[PDB]
Amino acid sequence: DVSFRLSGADPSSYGMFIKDLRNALPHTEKVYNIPLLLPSVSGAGRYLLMHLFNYDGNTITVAVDVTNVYIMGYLALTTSYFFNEPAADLASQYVFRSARRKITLPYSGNYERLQIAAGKPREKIPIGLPALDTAISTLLHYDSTAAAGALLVLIQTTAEAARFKYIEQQIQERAYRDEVPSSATISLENSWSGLSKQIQLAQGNNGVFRTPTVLVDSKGNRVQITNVTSNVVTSNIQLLLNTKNI
Ligand SMILES: Nc1ccn([C@@H]2O[C@H](CO)[C@@H](O)[C@H]2O)c(=O)n1
Ligand SMILES: *[C@@H]1O[C@H](CO)[C@@H](O)[C@H](O)[C@H]1NC(C)=O
């Protein structure tokens, strides 16, 4: 398991949590020095438990699929909550079984569906450590519309930060003041599968992408990523989605 406490949190403690999260994901090899997530894990070992504590010390446990860093569901007191999707239903066979009741959320976990449920795109939803405190608090008691927004915050401040050093740093800058994600942040989130694929394909193609990946940079300008020498590959991305799962 991994844990993060918002009470007393600062950029350093958040950084330690994201390091722990990354290190909790298993891999047998690295591709261009980046951990390659496994094609498959069997049984309960497929799921990592994240214990998150709001400023008041109340807690939820979030279940994360270790092959893709997808959030499956979470436990709040004696109630479990899972996304309305087959992968999450499968997860419910293994985690939070001791919960008194299980609620299936009225949406799947993908960004497009969560934004519809929340009533806004995540371009307009502030993120940061304060927002994460709010998200945890919202998830403690069921409210599906509120939870969609909370989950958009949760996914970005945990999973996406684990995937990209740039996103981790963006949240560290928002340790005491929320701000909507940069255009680059959104770009990286949307390109993780594509980037993971091209980096794996680059092995066997002299480090060259079979298909270029278009990203927005820290400046708001649209760059094109063609090979493993790019900063996105050498410094930014921290985990690769296995091509088996793409
Ligand atoms: N069950 C799920 C499904 C998806 N996701 C996140 O949303 C993105 C897909 O739009 C994915 O890239 C992933 O980050 C999630 O957190 N949990
Ligand atoms: C590889 O990517 C770098 C950085 O984006 C770029 O400068 C260079 O032109 C690319 N090299 C090749 C051979 O495409």
> Rounded distance, CA 55 to CA 85, Å?
31
> Rounded distance, CA 74 to CA 234, Å?
33
Give binding residues as ranges.
69-71, 85, 109-112, 122, 160, 163
Q: How many domains does the chain have?
A: 2
Residues 13 and 65 in one domain: yes
Radius of gyration over alpha carbons of the chain, in Å?
17
Residues 8 and 63 in one domain: yes
The experimental method behind these coordinates is X-ray
Residues 129 and 217 in one domain: no
Q: Domain boundary residue among 132, 162, 192? A: 162
- Which of these, 150, 152, 130, lies nearest to 55 by C-alpha position? 130
Q: Domain boundary residue among 102, 129, 162? A: 162
Ligand 2 centroid, distance to 195 Cα (angstroms): 15
Residues 146 and 180 in one domain: no
Give binding residues for CTP as ranges.
70-71, 85, 110-112, 122, 160, 163
Ligand 1 centroid, distance to 66 Cα (angstroms): 13
Whole domain around residue 179: which residue ranges?
163-246
Burial track 3-15 (b if 16+ CB lie within 10 A, e otherwise): ebebeebebeebe
Name residues whose C-beta falls within 8 Å of residue 98's C-beta, 6 or more positions apart in sequence: none
Q: Domain boundary residue among 119, 139, 162? A: 162
Q: Ligand 1 pocket test: which of 74, 155, 246 has the largest number of ligand atoms within 8 Å of its C-beta? A: 155
Q: CATH number of the domain that 195 lies in?
A: 4.10.470.10
Residues 152 and 135 in one domain: yes
Residues 48 and 136 in one domain: yes
The token duo for 33 is 């020095």
Residues 227 and 201 in one domain: yes
Residues 143 and 203 in one domain: no
Residues 172 and 117 in one domain: no
Q: Which residue out of 160, 168, 173, 189 is catalytically annotated?
A: 160
Residues 81 and 7 in one domain: yes
In which residue are the tokens 């990354």 written?
Answer: 22
Declared resolution, Å? 1.8
Q: Look up 160 and say whether it is catalytic.
A: yes
> Rounded distance, CA 230 to CA 4, Å?
32
Residues 112 and 136 in one domain: yes
> Rounded distance, CA 148 to CA 138, Å?
10
> Rounded distance, CA 168 to CA 161, Å?
4
Bridge partners (DSSP) of residue 30 are: 35
- Which of these, 49, 48, 52, 50, lies nearest to 140 by C-alpha position? 52
User: CB within 6 Å of ligand 2 — which residues?
Assistant: 226-227, 229-230
Residues 150 and 171 in one domain: no
Residue type, position 227, single letter: N
Q: For the chain, how are helix, strand and coil distributed in percent, rounded to 5?
A: 40, 25, 35
